[PDB]
Amino acid sequence: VNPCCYYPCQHQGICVRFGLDRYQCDCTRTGYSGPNCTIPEIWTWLRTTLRPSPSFIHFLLTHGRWLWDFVNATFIRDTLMRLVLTVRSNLIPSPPTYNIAHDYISWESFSNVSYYTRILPSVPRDCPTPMGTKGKKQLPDAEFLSRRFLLRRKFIPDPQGTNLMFAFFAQHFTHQFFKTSGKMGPGFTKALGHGVDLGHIYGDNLERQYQLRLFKDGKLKYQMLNGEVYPPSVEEAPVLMHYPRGIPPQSQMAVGQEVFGLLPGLMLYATIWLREHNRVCDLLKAEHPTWGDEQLFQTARLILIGETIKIVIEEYVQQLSGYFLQLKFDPELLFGAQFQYRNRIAMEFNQLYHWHPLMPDSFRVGPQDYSYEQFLFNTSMLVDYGVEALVDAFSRQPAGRIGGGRNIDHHILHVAVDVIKESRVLRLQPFNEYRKRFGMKPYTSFQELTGEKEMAAELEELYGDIDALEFYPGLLLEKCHPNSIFGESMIEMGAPFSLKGLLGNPICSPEYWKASTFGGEVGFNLVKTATLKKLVCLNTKTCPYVSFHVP
Amino acid sequence: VNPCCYYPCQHQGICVRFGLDRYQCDCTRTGYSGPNCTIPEIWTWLRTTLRPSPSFIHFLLTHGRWLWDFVNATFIRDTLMRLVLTVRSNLIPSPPTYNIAHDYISWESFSNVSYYTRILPSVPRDCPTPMGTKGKKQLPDAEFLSRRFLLRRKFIPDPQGTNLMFAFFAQHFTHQFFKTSGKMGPGFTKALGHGVDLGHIYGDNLERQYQLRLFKDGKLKYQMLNGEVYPPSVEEAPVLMHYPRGIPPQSQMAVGQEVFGLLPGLMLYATIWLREHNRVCDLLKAEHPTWGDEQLFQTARLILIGETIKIVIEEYVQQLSGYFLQLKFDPELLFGAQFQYRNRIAMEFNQLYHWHPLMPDSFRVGPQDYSYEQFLFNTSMLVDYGVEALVDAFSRQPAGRIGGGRNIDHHILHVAVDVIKESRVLRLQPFNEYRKRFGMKPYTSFQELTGEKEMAAELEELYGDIDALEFYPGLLLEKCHPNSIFGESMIEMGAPFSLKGLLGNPICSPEYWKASTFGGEVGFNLVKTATLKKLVCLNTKTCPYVSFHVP
Ligand code: HEM
Ligand code: HEM
Ligand SMILES: *[C@@H]1O[C@H](CO)[C@@H](O[C@@H]2O[C@H](CO)[C@@H](O)[C@H](O)[C@H]2NC(C)=O)[C@H](O)[C@H]1NC(C)=O
Ligand SMILES: *[C@@H]1O[C@H](CO)[C@@H](O[C@@H]2O[C@H](CO)[C@@H](O)[C@H](O)[C@H]2NC(C)=O)[C@H](O)[C@H]1NC(C)=O
Ligand SMILES: COc1ccc2c(c1)c(CC(=O)O)c(C)n2C(=O)c1ccc(I)cc1
Ligand SMILES: COc1ccc2c(c1)c(CC(=O)O)c(C)n2C(=O)c1ccc(I)cc1
Ligand SMILES: *[C@@H]1O[C@H](CO)[C@@H](O)[C@H](O)[C@H]1NC(C)=O
Ligand SMILES: *[C@@H]1O[C@H](CO)[C@@H](O)[C@H](O)[C@H]1NC(C)=O
Ligand SMILES: *[C@@H]1O[C@H](CO)[C@@H](O)[C@H](O)[C@H]1NC(C)=O
Ligand SMILES: *[C@@H]1O[C@H](CO)[C@@H](O)[C@H](O)[C@H]1NC(C)=O
């Protein structure tokens, strides 16, 4: 049997096969020696024997508001943050390593950008069981597993206060770097860019950007409806969109992310940003009468990438974590560090981010309470209500807890079924292995993963071994932190991929982080002071309650 | 007039335009302050007031063989080298900055890999003269300039001892990262990869690699002629090659770099590497009976990339420089440094590397002395003579000096004409500006550039200003160092682009520099001990005189 199915090599050592029955662990620079990379170095030993749990820490960061307030005002706000940045990032390899096709380093992996990368190689196709050595030869029926432990029975709202404004924000932002090529199969992405390139606004390819562009003042095309600015129609900007058969071009808004037409929340955010891009164009032209379309356009896009990275980090993250520590977005905290301004979307990351439980049972817009069947392909709700109305609405309605179990609405429960299935095609390693990869202790029993006995008992008879518990289910069934949106793993696997992905954008490099990159101090400050409220309000007649937190 | 035409901003500060008549220099992190980035910081001041000339240094490195021998044996061989690596590289920006289309940072520049990048933005299209502010409104006729100062009158052999083996090596290796898209125009490359990806062996695209591949044991296809291994025929591997009309497929060797069929030297090296790739496949399979085609193939290619980087660095560079200091290729000297494992071929670099003077007057193969007209599209010379014969020949025949003037053979003198012309389309800045970019003092007169009065006097009446002397001519007409192949600028602009380009390959990163990346200690050592002699000799029945130095 393939010795590597035993996952012999610890601490990131690489299991290389040799001969017909041998294997060797490459423990290069792992901090351990030995046949399985298990004997630590004196420093490695200390470093770990002194690492307080991710649990201990999540305690502190969510406690002592008073003590934090002070720290937040001291220089220490930078110091911590930096540490977080450096440390968190180390967990993610760069340049990237494996892909659906190669469980080894290779020029093709490194250069063929159509593949999502992956942190751990697949479960060798020649192992006894689907997960390697443990568990049953057959895995739990995805469908069943989904109805038993993920089907929302009673809506559990998120204790942190997260609202649909955040939910839709997350949905929008993620679909600019998560864009699986249905034509190529799982493992393949259409979002070459692998990051915050804002391609969900400008298009994932030149042709499409040129379609969406006004080619005047750096402006993005658009249309006026009710005296308000909205994305142009597919008639004006003949771009490919995914609207159900039967809807005319003149009723479809062209936007960049073909999929965005199937949900007002999505098309709401697409409108705020289009508005914002054209707004910045004006600020620029005023300053640089000499510039042309391209430069106004290119510089506009760099300012928005910056805005996005800031909001995404100081308001979007902040809310999620729940910490008292003022996460500061400052590309300079990294200038002294050894960091690689490069990123590549990992398949693990596309999964761990599939937070469908967030969606509510119905969508309340004032006295009006719309059903999924009334929300889903509603070409009229946005123009009808207008930005402000929806922004206030989503900002007020709570979104559901993400971790815990049985909280995904039946309407989209199929998506979770597909995710589990894809996981298997991708041949992802077991949850417990990823635990270790991200520096955590693997679970010893189902009752420790879930904080109880009922589900644990059944997961046990389904999986057989805790060491056979799959990635996604493991992520959504594990116990939440105190009054959290989710638990450990999400966070300990989530932030890494999720910070490296941001700080690793080229604009955060010393080479690009210059006022001139943004057209001068004005563009630069736009970036430096971006804010959710400013983003909405500087682009709306009135300024509604706008937050990632429910009032 | 465009204020930026005056190249106002010093020390890499960025000239941003404002209003109709203003401009601002972005001196961010330049080490200088002031409206033009001219007032240094106390440290910057010291650092430069104490920098011994590139001339002073090139003296030392080429002198004191005895003192060097010791240093070479001390730990200092690493220490220096490191310094060279770090320092040299800093001169080159990463992530990349401008391109033919954008004289500003931009997402498109950063992501559209079809463009060659450039270190200095173009000469604004709205400047008084072609070079900005100085010189004449009309530039010297390329053709004339070429016949007057570059046309080889009497063959000047290179004083360093360089032979055609080196010449062809340079030619081969460069055409894997220099591959201008004739269909797209100047500024565009077909070599996405921008570096040592060995695509001149495997193809610049998947389709073509699959054509060249045996799909057995990781082997590359091939054919036996005279009991010897040679690249397959276009009949066997239906791949696109550039052979003159009238030559049948059965007489064309398919190789990866379409252009390689027009010169035995080129097809000589293509044969040595194909041989080498298949040789390593065997070493691998033996070790890993369990592996398949892909993995043998992928791992083979990583070993060759490594071999190439080593030879290219310890034998190929060493020869050029002329230094006594043992350049050591060790990716680890950089593990402590802040380095970006990323590269992008600059247009300046495609020019500065256009060393056509190297080619001799005739090609001597034993008693036989072939003319260009007998060498150029000679489909039979390689199979006729075989690897060894040619390798001995080229290793024995000296190549001509590269710097100095009037040493390019008439047969290919057109190429220099085109280079000067392309330079102008690309709107490259003046030679003197690049001097400064790469930390050198700009020339004050033509007589200082050339080491004399005759050519200097005429270049002067042609250009008008030394500050209008173009890049390429400036590079090939400047005075050579003592008994050197070329001079300062070549070297002070050459090594940077040329080292960053190597150490910046992903395999040199801590992430990939592991024995497992190469299939174990065996592949790893193959890399670690690669050598020109081993490369040829382990792939030939007999081992001829093989060197980059003439006997
Ligand atoms: C109205 C509620 C929502 C609906 C209709 C929905 C539906 C879907 C569907 C159909 C898939 C594709 C997989 C498949 O079923 O074949 C998907 C993928 C995705 N969704 Fe949603 N989703 C919702 C909200 C969100 C939210 C709030 C997030 C959280 C950011 C999110 C994250 C994801 C991710 C990461 C993917 C993968 C993207 C890719 O594979 O390219 N979705 N969603
Ligand atoms: C038998 C002698 C040689 C011939 C026939 C030759 C010919 C050419 C020609 C035709 C061009 C293209 C530009 C044009 O004319 O439109 C070219 C480009 C090039 N050659 Fe050679 N060359 C020779 C040797 C070499 C050598 C020894 C080097 C040095 C490495 C070299 C370096 C270059 C470079 C850098 C380019 C640009 C590649 C690109 O634009 O893609 N060539 N050569
Ligand atoms: C990136 O990798 C994918 C997968 O190898 C390549 O796509 C396949 O390429 C081969 C040869 O062109 C085809 O036979 C397959 O049908 C292709 N598609 C799929 C979905 O496998 C793709 O060509 C590579 N892209 C680049 C730019 O190298
Ligand atoms: C990279 O940039 C080049 C130049 O912009 C793009 O090529 C041009 O693209 C437009 C739109 O497709 C065409 O009208 C031109 O004819 C294209 N060719 C040339 C030579 O200009 C190219 O499409 C870009 N590539 C990517 C992958 O973005
Ligand atoms: C201050 O830097 C950051 C930046 C982002 C961070 C965090 C810290 C933390 C916690 C921490 O690292 O402190 C989480 C929760 N983050 C996320 O945005 C996240 C990403 C993906 C997923 I799935 C879940 C969460
Ligand atoms: C030890 O690291 C290196 C590596 C490469 C080096 C050098 C040093 C030097 C000199 C130096 O930097 O010491 C030159 C001459 N190099 C070149 O290969 C070169 C590249 C392009 C061109 I055009 C001309 C020369
Ligand atoms: C290495 O791991 C394998 C598989 O778990 C195990 O059988 C072997 O005993 C281990 N060797 C050591 C020294 O831990
Ligand atoms: C779309 O939303 C509007 C509210 O703006 C509602 O009146 C309309 O009925 C919805 N359309 C569908 C098909 O549910
Ligand atoms: C800046 O450079 C411009 C153009 O060379 C020059 O006219 C001006 O005097 C300079 N200003 C200073 C303070 O050097
Ligand atoms: C090709 O080279 C051979 C020497 O191997 C020579 O005899 C032959 O004439 C050459 N062909 C041409 C067309 O010059």
* The three-state (H, E, C) secondary structure of A62-119, written as one string: CCCHHHHHHHHHCCHHHHHHHHHHHHHHHCCCCCCCEECCECCCCHHHHHCCCECEEC
Peptide bond into A249 cis (omega under 30): no
Which residues 268-327 of A have a C-beta within 8 angstroms of B? 287-291, 294-295, 298-299, 301-302, 305
Task: Give the burial class of A248: count Cβ atoms within 10 A of its Cβ; 0-12 exposed, 13-18 middle, 19 or more buried.
Answer: exposed
A302 and B16 within 8 Å at the Cβ level: the answer is no
User: Cα dihedral sign for A197, A200, A202, A203?
Assistant: positive
Instruction: For chain A, give percent helix, strand, coil, nearest 5.
Output: 45, 10, 45
| CATH value at residue B383 | 1.10.640.10
Residue A398's DSSP bridge partners are A163
Residues after which chain B is discontinuous, using a C–N cutoff of 2.5 Å: none
CB atoms within 10 A of CB A43: 9
How far is Cα A25 from Cα A4, in angstroms, rounded to an integer?
A: 9
Are A320 and A310 within one domain? Answer: yes
Structure tokens at B500: 């960053």
Name residue, tokens 């024997």: A49
Distance (angstroms) between ligand 4 centre and the Cα of A194 equals 20
Contacts of B95 in chain A (CB under 8 A): 341, 506, 509, 511-512
- Provide the b/e sequence for B133-144 (b: ≥16 CB within 10 Å): bbbeeebbebee
B86 touches chain A (CB under 8 A): no
Under 8 Å CB-to-CB from B218, ≥6 apart: which residues?
B281, B284, B285, B291, B293, B294, B295, B296, B297, B298, B299, B300
> How many angstroms separate the Cα of B401 from the Cα of each of A13, B371, B406, B483?
50, 20, 10, 10
- Chain B residues within 8 A of A112 when measuring between CB atoms: 206
Give the phi and the psi of residue A174 in degrees, each rounded to 5.
Answer: -70, -35
- Distance between CA atoms of residues B60 and A322, nearest Å: 61
Specify whether B364 is located in the same domain as B503: yes
Taking an 8 Å cut-off on Cβ atoms, the answer to whether A97 and B302 are in contact is no
- Cross-chain residue pair A197–B111, CB shorter than 8 Å: yes
Sign for the CA dihedral angle at B210, B214, B219, B224 comes to: negative
Distance CA A189, CA B22 (A): 45
**A7 and A15 Cβ atoms separated by less than 8 Å:** yes
- Helix, strand or coil, per DSSP, at residue B451: coil
- Tell me how far apart the alpha carbons of residues A14 and B512 are, in angstroms, rounded to a whole number: 11
Q: Tell me, what CATH number does B30's domain have? A: 2.10.25.10
C-beta of residue A88 within 8 angstroms of C-beta of residue B279:
no
- Answer yes or no: do A68 and A111 share one domain: yes
DSSP structural state of residue A317: I
Q: How far is the CA of B354 from the centre of ligand 2 (A)?
A: 6
What distance in Å separates the CA atoms of residue B147 and residue B141, rounded to the nearest whole number? Answer: 10
The Cα–Cα gap between B357 and B415 comes to 11
CB neighbourhood size of B420 (10 A): 22
Q: Which residues pair with residue B290 across a beta bridge?
A: none
Question: What is the Cα A532 distance to its own chain's centre?
Answer: 18
Residues 6+ away with beta carbon under 8 Å from A156: A400, A401, A404, A406, A407
Name the residue among B523, B448, B507 with its Cα closest to residue B478.
Answer: B448
Phi, psi (deg, nearest 5) at residue B33? -125, 180
> Which pair of tokens denotes residue A138?
């057959």
B104 and B17 in a single domain? The answer is: no
The residue ranges of DSSP E strands in A106-158, in sequence order, are: 117-118
- Residue B198 in tokens: 């060995």
Name the nearest CA neighbour of A265 among A124, A164, A190: A164
Query: What whole-number distance in Å separates Cα of residue A453 and Cα of residue A447?
Result: 6
B10 lines ligand 9 (CB under 6 A): no
- Cβ-based neighbour number of residue B48 at 10 Å: 12
User: What sections of B198-288 are H helices per DSSP?
Assistant: 199-202, 206-212, 264-287
Q: How many domains are contained in chain A? A: 2
Angstrom distance (rounded) from CA B175 to CA A32: 42
Of A6, A341, A353, A372, catalytic: A353
Chain A residues near residue B513 by CB distance under 8 angstroms: 28
CA–CA separation, A327 vs A317, rounded Å? 8
Per the DSSP assignment, residues forming a β-bridge with A363 are: A370
List CB contacts of A286: < 8 A, sequence separation 6 or more.
none
A188 plus A86 within the same structural domain: yes
- Listed in sequence order, the residues at least 6 apart from B515 whose beta carbon sits closer than 8 Å to its beta carbon are A26, A28, B521, B523, B524
The Cα-based distances of A542 to A387, A391, A459, A534, B313 in angstroms read 10, 11, 51, 12, 64
B462 vs B459: CA distance, rounded Å: 5
d(CA B397, CA B545): 11
Distance, CA of B395 to chain centre: 20
Q: Name, in order, each residue with C-beta under 8 angstroms of A405's C-beta and a sequence gap of 6 or more.
A: A149, A150, A450, A455, A476, A477
How far out from the chain centre does Cα A491 lie?
Answer: 11
What 8-state DSSP symbol labels residue B324?
S
Q: Do B511 and A298 touch (CB under 8 A)?
A: no
Question: Is residue B272 a contact partner of residue B539, using CB atoms and an 8 Å limit?
Answer: yes
Q: Sign of dihedral through CA atoms A287, A291, A297, A299?
A: negative
B499 lines ligand 6 (CB under 6 A): yes
Is residue B17 within 8 Å of B4, Cβ to Cβ?
yes
Instruction: Report how far apart, in Å, the C-alpha atoms of A194 and of each of A89, A104, A198, A267, A344 are.
Output: 16, 20, 10, 22, 5
Report yes or no: B103 and B127 within 8 Å, Cβ to Cβ: no
Name B391's bridge partners: none
Same domain, A79 and A214: yes
DSSP-assigned letter for residue B233? B
**Residue B411: in which H helix or E strand, if any?**
none
Q: List the one residue out of B372, B367, B439 whose CA is nearest residue B410.
A: B372
Looking at the structure, do residues A210 and A238 belong to the same domain, yes or no?
yes
The Cα A1–Cα A364 span in angstroms is 56
CB B387, CB B537: distance < 8 Å: no
Q: Give me the phi and psi of B55, to 5 degrees please.
A: -80, -45
Amino acid at A435: R
The dihedral built from the CA positions of residue B408, B411, B416 and B417, taken in this order, carries a sign that is positive
Asked if A323 and A467 sit in the same domain, the reply is yes
DSSP tag of A141: P
Q: How far is it, in rounded angstroms, from Cα B344 to Cα B348? A: 11
Structural contact between residues A225 and A194, judged by C-beta atoms closer than 8 angstroms: no
Whether A66 and A329 have beta carbons less than 8 Å apart is answered as no
Residues A157 and A297 in one domain: yes
For chain B, state the CA radius of gyration: 24
Q: Give, to the nearest 10 degrees, the angle between helix B164-174 and helix B264-287.
A: 70
Interface touch B515/A29, C-beta < 8 Å: no
Alpha-carbon gap, residue B218 to B291, rounded angstroms: 9
Residues in chain B: 551
Print the domain residue range for A2. Answer: 1-41
Distance in angstroms (rounded) separating the CA atoms of residues A470 and A490: 14
A480 in the same domain as A413: yes
> How many CA atoms lie less than 13 Å away from A275 in the CB half-sphere?
19
Selection from A492, A472, A473 nearest residue A481 by Cα: A492
Name the token pair of B543: 């081992």
Q: With a CB-CB cutoff of 8 Å, which residues 510-529 of chain B face chain A? A: 510-517, 519-520
Cis ω for the linkage preceding A186 (within 30 of 0)? no
Write the single-letter amino acid at B486. Answer: F
Looking at the fold, whether A425 and A463 belong to one and the same domain comes out as yes
Method of elucidation: X-ray
Q: B221-245 burial, b if ≥16 CB within 10 A, otherwise e? A: bbbeeeebbbbbbbebbebebebee
Are the C-beta atoms of residues A470 and A464 closer than 8 Å to each other?
Answer: no
- Residue A503, SS3? helix
* Among B491, B479, B166, residue whose Cα is nearest residue B319: B166
Q: In a 10 Å sphere around its CB, with 0-12 CB exposed, 13-18 middle and 19+ buried, how is residue B147 labelled? A: middle
For ligand 10, the distance from its centroid to the CA atom of residue B169, given in whole angstroms, is: 22
The reply to whether A31 and A76 lie within a common domain is no
Residues of chain B by 3-state class (helix, strand, coil), percent to 5: 45, 10, 45
Residue (of B242, B276, B246) closest to B256 by Cα position = B242
- Report phi then psi at B516, rounded to 5: -70, -25
CA-nearest of B53, B51, B47 to B30 is: B47
| Residue type at position A386 | G
What span, in angstroms and rounded, lies between the C-alpha atoms of A514 and B54?
Answer: 30
Look at the alpha carbons of B342, B345, B349, B355 in this order and tell me if their dihedral is positive or negative: positive
- Closest to A490 (Cα-Cα) out of A282, A303, A321, A270: A321
Tell me the DSSP string of B158-194.
Answer: -TT-BBHHHHHHHHHHHTTT--B-TTT-TTBBS-TT-
B8 touches chain A (CB under 8 A): no
The length of chain A is 551
Nearest 5°: the CA angle B506, A510, B34 is: 145
Structural contact between residues B61 and B321, judged by C-beta atoms closer than 8 angstroms: yes
Choosing from B247, B378, B390 the residue with most ligand 10 atoms within 8 A of its CB, the one to mutate for a pocket test is B378
- What would the DSSP string read from start to end of A252-310? -B--SSGGGGS-HHHHHHHHHHHHHHHHHHHHHHHH-TT--HHHHHHHHHHHHHHHHHH
Q: Phi first, then psi: what are they for B281, rounded to 5°?
A: -55, -45
| DSSP state, residue B44 | H
In whole angstroms, what is the distance from residue B162 CA to residue A12 CA?
A: 46
How far apart (Å, rounded) are the C-alpha atoms in residues A338 and A551?
Answer: 41
* Cis geometry, peptide bond prior to residue A95 (ω within 30 degrees of 0): yes
Give CA separation, B94 vs B293, B339, B506, in Å.
Answer: 35, 9, 14
Q: Of A329, A291, A286, whose CA–CA distance to A311 is shortest? A: A329
B441, B435 contact by CB (below 8 A): yes
| d(C-alpha A259, C-alpha A255), whole Å | 9
A354 is catalytic: no
Among the listed residues A301, A239, A252, the one whose alpha carbon sits nearest the alpha carbon of residue A276: A301
Taken in order B440, B449, B501, A295, the sign of the CA dihedral is: positive
- Spatial separation of the C-alpha atoms in residues A24 and A3, rounded to whole Å: 9
Q: What CA–CA distance (Å, rounded) separates B250 from B52?
A: 58
Would you say B298 and A108 are in contact if contact means Cβ atoms under 8 Å apart? yes
CB B176 within 8 A of CB B343: no
Instruction: Kindly state the helix (H) or strand (E) to which residue B229 belongs, with its residue range.
Output: strand B228-230
- Site to probe by mutation for ligand 4, drawn from A192, A204, A206 as the one with most ligand atoms within 8 Å of Cβ, is A206
Nearest CA in chain B to A305: B107
